[PDB]
Structure formats: C-alpha cells, structure tokens
Design a protein around this ligand. Structure first.
Ligand SMILES: *[C@@H]1O[C@H](CO)[C@@H](O[C@@H]2O[C@H](CO)[C@@H](O[C@@H]3O[C@H](CO[C@H]4O[C@H](CO)[C@@H](O)[C@H](O)[C@@H]4O)[C@@H](O)[C@H](O[C@H]4O[C@H](CO)[C@@H](O)[C@H](O)[C@@H]4O)[C@@H]3O)[C@H](O)[C@H]2NC(C)=O)[C@H](O)[C@H]1NC(C)=O
Ligand SMILES: *[C@@H]1O[C@H](CO)[C@@H](O[C@@H]2O[C@H](CO)[C@@H](O[C@@H]3O[C@H](CO[C@H]4O[C@H](CO)[C@@H](O)[C@H](O)[C@@H]4O)[C@@H](O)[C@H](O[C@H]4O[C@H](CO)[C@@H](O)[C@H](O)[C@@H]4O)[C@@H]3O)[C@H](O)[C@H]2NC(C)=O)[C@H](O)[C@H]1NC(C)=O
Ligand SMILES: *[C@@H]1O[C@H](CO)[C@@H](O[C@@H]2O[C@H](CO)[C@@H](O[C@@H]3O[C@H](CO[C@H]4O[C@H](CO)[C@@H](O)[C@H](O)[C@@H]4O)[C@@H](O)[C@H](O[C@H]4O[C@H](CO)[C@@H](O)[C@H](O)[C@@H]4O)[C@@H]3O)[C@H](O)[C@H]2NC(C)=O)[C@H](O)[C@H]1NC(C)=O
Ligand SMILES: *[C@@H]1O[C@H](CO)[C@@H](O[C@@H]2O[C@H](CO)[C@@H](O[C@@H]3O[C@H](CO[C@H]4O[C@H](CO)[C@@H](O)[C@H](O)[C@@H]4O)[C@@H](O)[C@H](O[C@H]4O[C@H](CO)[C@@H](O)[C@H](O)[C@@H]4O)[C@@H]3O)[C@H](O)[C@H]2NC(C)=O)[C@H](O)[C@H]1NC(C)=O
Ligand SMILES: *[C@@H]1O[C@H](CO)[C@@H](O[C@@H]2O[C@H](CO)[C@@H](O[C@@H]3O[C@H](CO[C@H]4O[C@H](CO)[C@@H](O)[C@H](O)[C@@H]4O)[C@@H](O)[C@H](O[C@H]4O[C@H](CO)[C@@H](O)[C@H](O)[C@@H]4O)[C@@H]3O)[C@H](O)[C@H]2NC(C)=O)[C@H](O)[C@H]1NC(C)=O
Ligand SMILES: *[C@@H]1O[C@H](CO)[C@@H](O[C@@H]2O[C@H](CO)[C@@H](O[C@@H]3O[C@H](CO[C@H]4O[C@H](CO)[C@@H](O)[C@H](O)[C@@H]4O)[C@@H](O)[C@H](O[C@H]4O[C@H](CO)[C@@H](O)[C@H](O)[C@@H]4O)[C@@H]3O)[C@H](O)[C@H]2NC(C)=O)[C@H](O)[C@H]1NC(C)=O
Ligand SMILES: *[C@@H]1O[C@H](CO)[C@@H](O[C@@H]2O[C@H](CO)[C@@H](O[C@@H]3O[C@H](CO)[C@@H](O)[C@H](O)[C@@H]3O)[C@H](O)[C@H]2NC(C)=O)[C@H](O)[C@H]1NC(C)=O
Ligand SMILES: *[C@@H]1O[C@H](CO)[C@@H](O[C@@H]2O[C@H](CO)[C@@H](O[C@@H]3O[C@H](CO)[C@@H](O)[C@H](O)[C@@H]3O)[C@H](O)[C@H]2NC(C)=O)[C@H](O)[C@H]1NC(C)=O
Ligand SMILES: *[C@@H]1O[C@H](CO)[C@@H](O[C@@H]2O[C@H](CO)[C@@H](O[C@@H]3O[C@H](CO)[C@@H](O)[C@H](O)[C@@H]3O)[C@H](O)[C@H]2NC(C)=O)[C@H](O)[C@H]1NC(C)=O
Lengths: 143, 100, 195, 101, 143, 194, 99, 142, 194
C-alpha cells in the first residue's frame, strides 16, 4: 500500500513471452503480428527488464522495397541482451499502415517499449509491469 | 494498469519460469561526472531474480493484465514522443490513497 | 538450348501464334524468401497486380465467339476438354485461385507466387499433361538464369488440320478478329504486340 | 488557470448564451483494447446531449474566457513548444492547495 | 471543497464563440486576428468539447506566396465535426511573424489547442475550460 | 496592342512622350480575392515596394522645374491634376490612396485592386478623360488587359508650335528629364525611351 | 536534488556578496500575446543582497546538485527538455509524510 | 519547508565567475573535454545570475565541422553578458560530444545543458533548486 | 636573398637529388589561432597521419642498410648526422616534436603554430644550417609560401668526382633509392622526379 518514498522507487520490467511457453520459433512468432492503417504509433518508457532468449531483427519491405516499419525515434536503441538474434526477412504484398501485434504484447526496445515496430533493429515481445520496491527489498531480490 | 508492492514484512504482496535473467541500470568517487561515467553500453548490469515465494509467477501473470488498460491510455494521448508514466503512477497513488 | 527444344517438340507440327507482352510503366520486382535468404529480383511484367491482368486475357476469349455459320466455336474446340496452353499461367493451371494461392499468417506471406514458379525451376504440373520448363516462357533473361527476364511469351498451339479441312475453318476464322482485337485492345497497363 | 468541481448535489452543486451544446467526445466489446480491433483515429468520436437545467452552459462559456487571462501567461513563460499537458499540473496543484495543514 | 479520484477525471472542454452570439460571419470574423514578431508559439492539449456552428480553412499568404502560418506538428489534426466549413482566402502585404488573436481566444484543433494558427486546415475560435467529473455525474449529464 | 490604336493619334492633335518602366529583380506577384476565387497574377512592376518608388519618381518628375530667364516655370500652367496616363492616376497620384488599405487586421479585404478594376472607392481618372486598363499595361495577353509585365507612362503635351510663349517651356520640359533618367539611382527599376 | 526552503533575518532549511541576476517579469491588456513585451523585453534586472549570509550558502549548494542531477539525466531516455518542476512537487508531497 | 503552488520553486543558475574560479580566456578551456558514448541531455531553469564572462566559442574539426551539438529551436542565447569572449579553437584528435570535467553545466536561455551547442553564447554554472513565495521574493529581489 | 644562398648547393662537388611528393586524396586543412584571427588554411599534405608517413619513411631510409661488399657502411660517414633540407628538419625529424601537442584538454592551444609558423620550443634547424622556409614549399600564390600544396625533400650528396675511394659508397647509395621509390608500397603519398 503506502510504501512509496521517492519517485524512482517504482520500476517497470517487460517480461518476455517465453515465460508462458509461447513459441519463439522463426515460424510461429510471425503468426501473432498483422497490419492496420488509421491508428497512431505510441511509445512508453520502462526502467529495467528481462533479457530475451530469442530476439528478432526483421526488416519487412513492400514489393517496391520500402520498409513498412516506422523510422525509429532518436531515443530508440537496440535491445541490450539477447541469447539468439533471428534475422527473419520477407515481404507483405497487400498489407498497409503500420505494423501491429494481435495478442496485445508490446514490442520491447532499449528502455522504451512501443506499440509498433521500428526500422530494422532488434526487439522482443513482452508486456511491461509496474511495481513499487525500495533499495532494501530490491537488494535481496536483484541477486 | 495495476501496480503491486512487494515488500518484506513476511514476503507478502499487495496492490512461469524461475530463470529470470535481467539487466538493470547500475546503482572511485569520480563516476558521477559524465566524462568519467561508464557509458550507456556498460551501464547494464547482469542480475538474477529467484522465485522463492511466487515472485516471478505472480509478475508474469501481471504482464498481460496491464496490457488491457495501458493500450487504451496510449490511444487517448495525442503526443507520440516518449511518455513517462513514472509521474502518472505517483500522482495517481497520492490521489487514491486519501480516503474519507 | 535456345531453339533446340522448339524445333523438335513444337516445331512444324502445330500452327501456333506467338505474341510478346511488355510492361513499360511497371517498376522493378524483387523477392526475398521468408526464411533468411537471397534477394532474387524479378522483371517489370510481374508483381502482385499485373499477374491478374494477364490472368484475365484468356478468360475473355471463349466468351466472345466469331459469328461463323450457326455454331459456337471457342478455344476449347480448336485445340487438340483441357487444351495446351504455354505461358506462365499454365504453371497455375490458368486459374485465379492458384495465382493468388497465398500461404502464410497475417504478417508474412510465406509462399505467394513461388509455390509453382520458383519451386520447379501444390504441384506445378501443366493442365495439358505435358512437361513444363521455366525457359520456354521467359524471354530477355541473362546467362543461365531463367527467372531474371523482362518479358512473358504466350503461345497457343493450334492443330494444322492438314488432313481435315472441316475443323480447319473453325481454327482459321477465330483469330481474324483477335488479330484486330490485339491492336484495338483496351489496356492501360499491359502492352502486347507481335514479336 | 482556475477549475470548478463539476460535481453532483452531494440539483447540481457547483464549486470554485445558447442552451444547445453539440459536443464530440471520446468514449470513456471483448476485443476493443487491441488497436488492430479498435475503432481508429476518425471513429472514436461520439455525439452528446447536454441539458442546461441548472444554468449550466452559460457560466462555463463565461468561465472559459476568464481562463485565457492566465493560461496565456503560463504558456509564454515555459520554453517547451510542442505540447504542454496541464492534466498533471492541475492534479498536483489540487494536492498542493489541499494539504494546507 | 471538490473531490478527485483519478487523474483522467479532469476534462478540458473548449467552448466556442459561435454559441456565445459572437459574430462568426466571414465579413467581420477576420478582425479579431493580427500579427506580431517575437512571441513564441505554444500548444495546449484538451480532452473533448463543443464543435462550433462554423469552421475556417484560411490560407493566408504573403505577396511572394509563402503561407504566413506555422507548419502543423504531427500532433495536430483537423477539427472533427463542423456544421459549416467557411473557406476564406485572405492576403496581406504587411504581416510580421506569426498570427495571433486579439481577444486572447485560442485556435482549436483535434484535441490540441494553440495560441497561434497552423497551415491551411480546419480550426475554430474558442476558450478552454477545465473541470472535474467522476463516472456517475458525467454519465448523468452526458447521457 | 498600342501601335494600331495610337496610329490615329499621330496626327496634328497631341504630342505624347512615351517611357517604359520595368522591374528587373522583383519576384512574381499574385492577388487572391478576399472571399474566395482564382489567384490572378499581376506583372513584376505591381508589388507594394515598387510603383511607390514610381509614385515618388512621378512626384520628383512633376515638382522639379527648370527656370528659364526671369519668367515663372510651372507644370500646371502648361499641362492640359494634369493629363497623366498611368496606373497611379487611378489613385490620383497620391500616397494615401495608393496605400488605402480598406481592411481590418490580419488580412486586408482589399488594398490595390479596389481602385484599379473595382467599379470602373474612386474608379475614375484624376483628369476626367477616358482611360482604359490596357493603355498602361504593356505586354498583356489578349482579353486580360492586366496580365502584362511592364509599365508605360505617357505625358500628352501640347505641340505649342503656334504658341511662342510656351515654345521655350516645351523645349526645356524634357531637357532635365533626358539626363534625370540616367542619373537617378535605382537598383530595382529601369527606364527606357521608346 | 536537495532543495532549501527560504522563509521569513531569513530562516533556511534544506563567496561573493554581490548577486545581480535577471528574472522573468512579474497591465490591462498586456496579458494578450499581441500586446506582450516580447522575448527580449521580458527579462527584468535586479539585485540580491547577501543579507543573512543568504548568497554564500546558495552558491555552495551548486556543486552538491551537480553530483545528483548528472545521474538523474543519465537514466532518462528523452533528449528533449526535462522539466524537474513536477518531480520536485511530487517528491515534496511523497516525503512530507515523515513530518 | 512549505509549498503552496507549483510556480513557487525556482532553479537559479549560479555562475563560476563569482566563485573566483578563473574565467580568463587562457584558464577556461582547461575544464572541458570530449567523449564518445554518452547522450546529450537538457534541463530547464526559471531564472539565472548575470554573467561577468560569456563565451561564444565555435570549435571545429580540421575539416571544418563543429563538434558541438546542433542547438534546438528551444535553446536560445544567454540574455545579458558583461563581456563576450569569441575564442576559437580546433580539436586535432578529440571526438564525440563536448563535456565538462568539474560537473558544471553550460548555461543557456532558461534551459541548462550538459553538452555544448554551436556558435552561441553560454556561461558555466550549476543549478540550484529552491523555494520562494511572493512575500519573501520582493523582500529579496531588488 | 633569393640567389645568394642558392649558390652554395649548385656547385659541381654537390650532386643533389630533388624529389617532390604530395597527398592527392587528402582534403582541405584549415587552422585558426588560439585567441582569434584569420582561419589560415593549410595545404592538403599538411595534416595529421600524412606527415607521419613521410617521417616514418625518412627514418627507414638510413635504418635499412643493404649488404654491400663484405662491410657495413652508413650514409653518415659518406655524406657531406647528414644535413636534411626540408620541412621535416624543422621538427628535428622526431615523432615527439612533429606531434608535440602543447596545450590542454578540450582544444589544443598549439600543434603547428609553434613549429611551422613560429619561424614565419626550437624552430630553427638543429644541424647548424639555416634554410629559407620558402624553398621547401612550391606551387603557391604570390609571396605567401604558407599556402601551398607541395613538399620538397633535399638530400645533399657529394659528387666525389676526384675521390674514387668514397665515390662507390655514394654512387650506389641512390641506385637503391630510385629502385625503392618505384617499388615503395604506400596508399597516400606519391614520389615524383623533378
Ligand atoms: C495472457 O495470457 C494468456 C494465456 O497465455 C493469453 O491468452 C491467449 O489469448 C489469445 C488471444 O489472441 C488466444 O489466441 C486466440 O485463440 C483463439 C482460438 O484459435 C485457435 O486456438 C486453438 C489453440 O491454438 C486451436 O485449437 C483452434 O483451432 C482455435 O481456432 C482465436 O481467437 C485466435 O485465432 C484467431 O486468429 C487466427 C489468425 O492468426 C485464426 O485462426 C483466426 O483468425 C482466429 O480467429 C487466437 O489463436 C490464445 O489461445 C490464448 N492462450 C491461452 C493459453 O489461453 C494472452 O495472450 C495473454 N495476453 C497477452 C499476451 O496480451
Ligand atoms: C539478374 O541477375 C541476378 C540474379 O541472377 C540478380 O542479382 C541479384 O541481386 C541481389 C541484389 O543486388 C544480389 O545481392 C544479394 O543481396 C543481399 C544483400 O544482403 C543484404 O541485403 C540487405 C542490404 O540492405 C540487408 O537488409 C540484408 O540484411 C542483407 O545483409 C544478399 O541476399 C546476398 O548476399 C549473399 O549472397 C549469396 C547468398 O547465396 C552469397 O554467395 C553471398 O556471399 C552473400 O552472402 C547478395 O549480396 C544477389 O547476389 C543477386 N542474386 C543472385 C546472384 O543470385 C540481378 O539483379 C538480376 N538483374 C535484374 C535486372 O533483375
Ligand atoms: C468574456 O467574454 C465577453 C463577451 O465576449 C467579453 O466581453 C467582450 O470583451 C471584449 C474585450 O476585447 C470587447 O471587445 C472590445 O470592446 C470594445 C468595444 O468598444 C467599441 O464600441 C463600438 C463598436 O462599434 C465603437 O464605438 C468603438 O469601436 C468602440 O471601440 C473595444 O475596446 C474594442 O474594439 C476593438 O475592436 C477590434 C478588436 O475587437 C479592433 O479592430 C478595434 O480597433 C478595437 O480596438 C473591442 O471590440 C467586447 O466588446 C466585449 N463584449 C461584451 C458583450 O461585453 C468579456 O471581456 C469576457 N469576460 C471576462 C474576461 O470576464
Ligand atoms: C496570364 O494568364 C492567366 C490570366 O489570364 C494567368 O493564369 C492564372 O494562373 C493561375 C495559376 O497561377 C490559374 O490557376 C488557378 O490557381 C489556383 C489553384 O488552386 C489552388 O491553388 C493552391 C494549391 O496549393 C491553393 O493555395 C489555392 O487555395 C487553391 O486551392 C486557384 O486559384 C484556381 O483554381 C480555380 O480554377 C477555376 C477558376 O475558375 C475553377 O473552376 C476551379 O474550381 C478553381 O476554383 C486556378 O486553378 C488561374 O486560373 C489563372 N487565372 C485566370 C485564368 O484568370 C497566367 O498565370 C498569366 N500569366 C502570367 C505570366 O502572369
Ligand atoms: C564543490 O566541490 C567541487 C569538488 O567536488 C569543487 O570544484 C573543484 O573540483 C575539482 C575536481 O575535483 C578540483 O580540481 C582538481 O584538483 C586537483 C589539483 O591537483 C593539482 O595539484 C598540484 C597543485 O595543487 C599540481 O600537481 C597540479 O596542478 C595538480 O593538478 C586535481 O585532482 C585536478 O587537476 C586536474 O588537472 C588537469 C585538468 O586539466 C588534469 O589533467 C588532471 O588529471 C587533473 O584532473 C583538478 O584540478 C578543485 O580543487 C575543486 N575546487 C576547489 C576550490 O576545491 C568546488 O570548488 C566546490 N564548490 C563549489 C561552490 O562548486
Ligand atoms: C590562400 O590564401 C587565401 C587568402 O588568405 C585564403 O582564403 C582566405 O583566407 C583568409 C585568411 O588569409 C580568410 O579570411 C578570414 O576569414 C574569417 C572570416 O570567416 C568567418 O566568416 C563568418 C563570419 O561572419 C563565420 O562563418 C565564421 O566566423 C568564419 O570564421 C576571419 O577570421 C577573418 O576576418 C576577420 O579577422 C580579421 C583578422 O585580422 C579581422 O580584421 C576581423 O576580425 C575580420 O572579421 C578573415 O576574413 C578566408 O576565410 C579565406 N577564404 C576562404 C574562401 O577560405 C585561401 O583559402 C588560401 N588558399 C588555399 C587553397 O587554401
Ligand atoms: C539488424 O539488421 C539491420 C539490417 O541489415 C542491420 O543494420 C546494418 O548495420 C550495419 C552495421 O552493423 C550497417 O553497416 C554500416 O552502415 C553505414 C553505411 O550504410 C556505415 O555506418 C558503415 O560503413 C557500415 O557499412 C548497415 O548499413 C545496416 N544495414 C541497413 C540495411 O541499414 C543491423 O546491424 C542488424 N542488427 C544486428 C544487431 O545485427
Ligand atoms: C483546407 O484547405 C487545404 C488547402 O488550403 C486543403 O488541403 C488540401 O488537401 C488535399 C486533400 O484533401 C490535398 O491534395 C493532395 O495533395 C497531394 C499532392 O497531390 C497528395 O497527397 C494527394 O494526391 C492529393 O492530391 C491538397 O494538396 C491540400 N492542399 C494544400 C495546399 O496543402 C484541405 O483539404 C482543406 N480542408 C478541407 C477541404 O476540409
Ligand atoms: C558567435 O559566433 C557565431 C559564429 O560566427 C555567430 O553566429 C553566426 O552569426 C552570423 C552573423 O549574424 C550569421 O550569419 C547570418 O548569415 C545570413 C546572411 O549571410 C543571414 O541569415 C544573417 O543575416 C546572418 O548574417 C550566422 O548564421 C550565425 N551562425 C549560427 C550557427 O548561428 C554568432 O552571432 C556569434 N554570437 C554573437 C553574440 O556575436
């Protein structure tokens, strides 16, 4: 309850989809994504998080060649730690708009999670979680 | 977006794999200067969260609980830059704490 | 390997008509496999739309028949029932569904126009029970690559009818309007001509 | 800027002209949260019926143009230009002026 | 007193001048604006509100041809509902800086208002009023 | 056209002095009507800045007089205010009318075309004689009469062949002009003779 | 980001004697942007007297803030202007519960 | 420790010039350096001290490009300076973004910066967060 | 003065070899003083990592010794500490002096201000022979030799016409040098003859 002392006591990790045993293979992970036009892209900032077992570096292009993923903001960087990086490549001939997820999972990037996919750089699936811990509790749980 | 509070005393909570390998922002004496800092590459520190009393398991389930409301929240805002919910939670926590 | 096959199996046996198809305004086409693979660029006359444009040419042939006597003669009657069609379209059995037989989820098309085209450079067998080759149809290719051309060659093998003149007149007057039709064809994207 | 508490009686009790008020509002079905199955950017607007049954619209229009007296001063001082959301500030100023000791 | 439960309970409705019996006719609706140099342009975000009887799509240009109004940020969109979209094309030879309002009224756009006016797209004059409602009182009156 | 229409004026009726004012570096200017309408483009010599320096040029032309002997030299006594064929004569050669912006703030309802082709708010020449919009716009395209690119100025002066009193005046009227045209400093205007 | 609270012979609670500064100006129609002073004319000059040793302890706080604010700016990911006015307000309320 | 309204808190910028810290054009370039790997950051402030010494330094690489960051439209020149020093220098081998060693901030128009912005006036100093109400302010301000 | 100092090296006893090297791929180099001043630009071959390579190779000229006859003979005993007339001798042909970054952090106070333009830490030659700085630099406008793009290396070699005993040591000294320059592996600097 009333355990908030100072602003950065609150933490935001994005737990990856591998926990629920959701297939992160280079064949089934593309089944949870789709396209839509008419919605705005949005960003959300998170402090720390789990490193993913498998990460994706996908640059989808239209038949013309332009990357359907949005231009990354300057504060958007590569994902810190990944055991496996999958360079899945391919095209979508009919879809339009911006890339969106189906299940509701966010695309996790360097300390900023997003509702869309950015141009040609490493990300992972996940959902960010909010909680309140101080340094005494966090010390005995961090390691 | 619900927000629990894991605090010791009893490792109880308030308001799934055991291998939780995370990275965190690190928390002689000249390091606070940006010229003598560690950089953004080396800022990340390795860590390991143990699930001794259902701590990971109660947090992985929370992940898709928060995906419901957070998606609606980002829909309303007309600002497409990075949105800090850090103050949002703190202000909301103060508002909902005062009762009666 | 250029004129050897055409002079031994479809030589002076069937009187066929050959026309070339050009697509000037269409841009370049590239393909990359869904598993991490090599960018294989294709020619102008193929993409995701002009595929349907050349798909509608043959289906608009049998419906309109030349007013000859009191009988109705289509492409089915003049051939040797499924007929012999040599094009890219016979790789899809000249049907709309196979040409757009998309396989994949909502984010990738794993296999859209290479289940039948690039697989044999869902079987790609021809509709007339004969062998198919990727080099008989694609003209303008460079070196040994057959799938790196810029034009499509469509030919319609028609029986010579030398020993039977009763069916020769059926095979003689159908394309008299068609040769007038190709120069008067309403086509804003595809351009066709003789040689 | 000042803001009244537009709350209920416990009539329509108030706190610190045309009767017709046509408004457009953002809504406050199982798969509505995911943006792929959402309305979009042009179809989240809902029409509204407002009754001016307690001298209601008339004072808010008079109050709206007393707000421009002080909101324009605040925007001039701040150095940021793209967007300045006061939704946080009104919440903090509500708490700052409530816990007065 | 005044009560407040959660942050989004505050809404800022922009009440327009059209219903306030202020002359919106195009002959005398362009005398409430002017120009000035040295005043920074600022934006302000609002949640909902009234849409006016009339709306304006004005393309003010210098004698060279350049639009005198600011380029709209990506945050700014067209005003959604307008009963009449009045289209006036005005030109002046002696402008300076950015366009400003005489009465202090704001130019209302899609959920973001501004002290200045933007390039060639629909707005309305109005003023922002902030207030507090919970779920049950708003639903009683909004209906 | 001007050669065919002024061919009949070449007889022994009046003598006119033709000069051409052209704007080298002034950018293209357009005017759009206040309510709505098509953007009508004007000629280079039709921008707030330019044409006023021509009004100043015209003022300097008319006010300077060349004294001859002990007699009084005035333009008013010899001119047929005077007979001026220009655009500025629609404004009566006055700075107030040329910048008579009948408009509110933000944008002016009408500032320049409200005296040129408005009601042809004065719409008549300062002398009262006939005047047409295609007599001053040189280079117009057919039926526009206002889509030209250069200005022409015409001073109809009496021949004074039978008037010995004003013969010297007519002789000395342009003596200062023929060297005032090539000593006046102007980096955005050119004056040409015929 | 420790902050003293000036009050009242000044009572303080968390060298050059002279202190001349500039400040944002603190009139009928002046609040209208068209009737404003502008960017250049907004600044007002003034002096601060080092009355109750008030200047000297203000300047020694300068290096104590730079120790903490560098770390704060390193964690945040946004390159745009960062307004700490809200954070100091929330931190003041959050830490007020002790006393 | 009292606070009533959000605009009570001020962020004063106290300059190194009054701290008898050498602001001469020979002893002022010794407190700056460069690094590659850190991101630029900004912090706003309400009001600031008058500056005895200001700098308008434009440091360029041997090709000519200025190593200093491109200033946003938000950042403007320092309001009032007693003296403006137009020092010019070049980095032979240094690269990255300009940083400060002592921990001080490059002060600009109401928004302080950790880094250095091109060809435009700044002063060195820190930021002091402090709370004053209206009654105390006029008792102190002039 | 001009031809006054040149008479002591055109003598028959000295057979001097001249080679001119430049850096074509290098871009423009500008330098500005520490307080303020004019941004005086340097030549393309006057930059960092382009004079080091010249300094690296000139040390290797005497470092590498060819096995001639059955004894080892150095250039020092046959040349007449051999005298070097170039721009490299202004830095005493040493790596530390040529990169003597005197100064501080942020930007360096001086790198070539106290070495090259100082004659325009020691600046004169250390071998006891003064040399005019305009001889090493060619292809420059007017008198300003500090605004050129060419480098000249001068190696004084005795003719030894009357001394056949020491002639063979110096006669074959440059025979490998002309073989070296056509076989020299380098990506930046090109050796030219006259
Ligand atoms: C919170 O955590 C839970 C538990 O892990 C997750 O719950 C999953 O929710 C998703 C929602 O999309 C479920 O997936 C959907 O299931 C439906 C059934 O589809 C097939 O599923 C079974 C088993 O896979 C098949 O045997 C059978 O053929 C069903 O047809 C459908 O609604 C969805 O499929 C739709 O899309 C596909 C296109 O890709 C097409 O088949 C059709 O369009 C179809 O309508 C979809 O598959 C999923 O089953 C749930 N899992 C569990 C274990 O319950 C949440 O996702 C998680 N929340 C997050 C991450 O935000
Ligand atoms: C007629 O001739 C040939 C085919 O017969 C066509 O040439 C092909 O064109 C492509 C594109 O130019 C050739 O290049 C290949 O491109 C890819 C580059 O890899 C990167 O691609 C983008 C770059 O932005 C990145 O996003 C992406 O992550 C990759 O990093 C790769 O697919 C190829 O590299 C590999 O190629 C083969 C793999 O089998 C290996 O041998 C190589 O070592 C290398 O690993 C490659 O570079 C391609 O090679 C050509 N295909 C061939 C020869 O079969 C002509 O364009 C065509 N002409 C016309 C007019 O269509
Ligand atoms: C909230 O809303 C109400 C209703 O809108 C406001 O009341 C209006 O306040 C504005 C403030 O600017 C008033 O506008 C000004 O009123 C004056 C009118 O005087 C003129 O009267 C006649 C008009 O024909 C003439 O004799 C002569 O022009 C007089 O000047 C003048 O001060 C202003 O005239 C200006 O007009 C335009 C700009 O508007 C300029 O071009 C002119 O040069 C001139 O400066 C101006 O019109 C308005 O009249 C008020 N209306 C009413 C109904 O009272 C309240 O102020 C506000 N409530 C608050 C804050 O509590
Ligand atoms: C000599 O000859 C003629 C005059 O006799 C001049 O031609 C005029 O030139 C303009 C273009 O410079 C013609 O075109 C008009 O341009 C406008 C374009 O509309 C949009 O323009 C921009 C787009 O970004 C917007 O800012 C603007 O608001 C408009 O949305 C419009 O003004 C006109 O469109 C109208 O066209 C006709 C007009 O009746 C209507 O049917 C349409 O619905 C529409 O309202 C127009 O297209 C203009 O027409 C020409 N004027 C005429 C014919 O009188 C030559 O330029 C001139 N030559 C020189 C060298 O000066
Ligand atoms: C707030 O608190 C800070 C400190 O936290 C004070 O600010 C200054 O802090 C700096 C950094 O620590 C101090 O300066 C350093 O002092 C040392 C001096 O060593 C010299 O020792 C002798 C001379 O006494 C000589 O051998 C030689 O000159 C040595 O340098 C050194 O640690 C540092 O020297 C640096 O020199 C160059 C810099 O270009 C580098 O190459 C070196 O490696 C080295 O880093 C440095 O000079 C300084 O002393 C502090 N000042 C004071 C007055 O104590 C603030 O003063 C304090 N107060 C306020 C209001 O802000
Ligand atoms: C061969 O030599 C010629 C002739 O010298 C070189 O060309 C010019 O070289 C001169 C120096 O000899 C340079 O002139 C100097 O340039 C500076 C002006 O540049 C500033 O421009 C603006 C200022 O508004 C800003 O972008 C920025 O501040 C630039 O620095 C000044 O340093 C000098 O003028 C000032 O200094 C003198 C010093 O006495 C004082 O009178 C005043 O303070 C004065 O304002 C000076 O003008 C010039 O830049 C060179 N030109 C070019 C085009 O590069 C040749 O380059 C050289 N040839 C080769 C092949 O390298
Ligand atoms: C994820 O995939 C993308 C796309 O292939 C990779 O981006 C590539 O990154 C490399 C460097 O790692 C870039 O090479 C560099 O590019 C520029 C010139 O283009 C320049 O800085 C260097 O000379 C160098 O060549 C490469 O261009 C870039 N490719 C594209 C298409 O943008 C990215 O690295 C991958 N991520 C990981 C973690 O592997
Ligand atoms: C308000 O007026 C403005 C003009 O002042 C209108 O903007 C115009 O919007 C149309 C589309 O509705 C634009 O046309 C498009 O332009 C480009 C180039 O051709 C391209 O994206 C499309 O093919 C299409 O033609 C038009 O350019 C644009 N005009 C300007 C000057 O930007 C706006 O639509 C009006 N609002 C209304 C009518 O509600
Ligand atoms: C500090 O030094 C910098 C670098 O020299 C100065 O900034 C530069 O100032 C000049 C002169 O105002 C600007 O030149 C401009 O060029 C065009 C015409 O050529 C036109 O836009 C202006 O009339 C002006 O002359 C130059 O753009 C500007 N550079 C930058 C990057 O802002 C600066 O003025 C100096 N500061 C002080 C206080 O003197």
């Amino acid at each position: 309850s009333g355990t908030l002392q100072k602003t950065e006591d609150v933490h935001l990790m994005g737990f990856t989809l591998s926990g629920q045993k959701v297939a992160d293979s280079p064949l089934e992970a593309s089944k949870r994504w789709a396209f839509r036009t008419g919605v705005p892209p949005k960003n959300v900032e998170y402090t720390e998080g789990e490193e993913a077992k498998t990460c994706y570096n996908i640059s989808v292009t239209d038949p013309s060649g332009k990357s359907l993923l949005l231009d990354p903001p300057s504060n958007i960087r590569d994902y810190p730690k990944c055991k496996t990086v999958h360079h899945i490549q391919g095209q979508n001939p009919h879809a339009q708009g911006i890339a969106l997820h189906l299940w509701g999972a966010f695309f996790l990037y360097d300390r900023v999670a997003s509702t869309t996919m950015y141009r040609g750089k490493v990300f992972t699936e996940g959902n960010i979680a909010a909680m309140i811990v101080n340094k005494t509790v966090h010390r005995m749980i961090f390691s | 977006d619900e927000s629990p509070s894991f605090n010791t005393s009893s490792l109880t909570f308030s308001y799934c794999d055991a291998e939780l390998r995370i990275w965190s922002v690190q928390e002689a004496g000249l390091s606070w200067i940006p010229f003598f800092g560690p950089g953004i590459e080396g800022l990340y520190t390795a860590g390991l969260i143990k699930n001794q009393n259902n701590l990971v398991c109660r947090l992985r389930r929370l992940a898709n609980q928060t995906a419901k409301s957070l998606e609606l929240l980002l829909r309303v805002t007309t600002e497409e830059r990075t949105f800090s919910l850090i103050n949002r939670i703190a202000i909301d926590f103060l508002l909902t704490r005062w009762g009666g | 390997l250029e004129k050897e096959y055409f002079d031994q199996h479809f030589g002076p046996f069937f009187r066929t008509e050959q026309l070339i198809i050009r697509a000037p305004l269409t841009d370049k086409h590239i393909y990359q496999p869904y598993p991490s693979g090599a960018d294989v660029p294709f020619g102008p006359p193929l993409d995701i739309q002009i595929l349907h444009q050349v798909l509608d040419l043959q289906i608009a042939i049998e419906n309109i028949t030349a007013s000859y006597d009191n009988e109705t003669v289509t492409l089915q009657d003049i051939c040797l029932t499924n007929c012999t069609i040599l094009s890219v379209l016979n790789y899809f059995q000249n049907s709309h569904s196979v040409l757009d037989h998309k396989k994949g989820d909502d984010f990738f098309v794993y296999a859209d126009y290479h289940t039948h085209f690039l697989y044999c450079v869902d079987p790609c067998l021809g509709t007339f029970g004969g062998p198919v080759f990727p080099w008989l149809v694609l003209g303008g290719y460079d070196d040994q690559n057959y799938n790196n051309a810029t034009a499509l060659v469509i030919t319609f093998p028609v029986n010579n009818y030398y020993n039977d003149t009763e069916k020769l007149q059926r095979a003689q007057a159908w394309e008299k309007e068609f040769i007038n039709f190709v120069k008067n064809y309403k086509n804003p994207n595809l351009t066709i001509s003789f040689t």
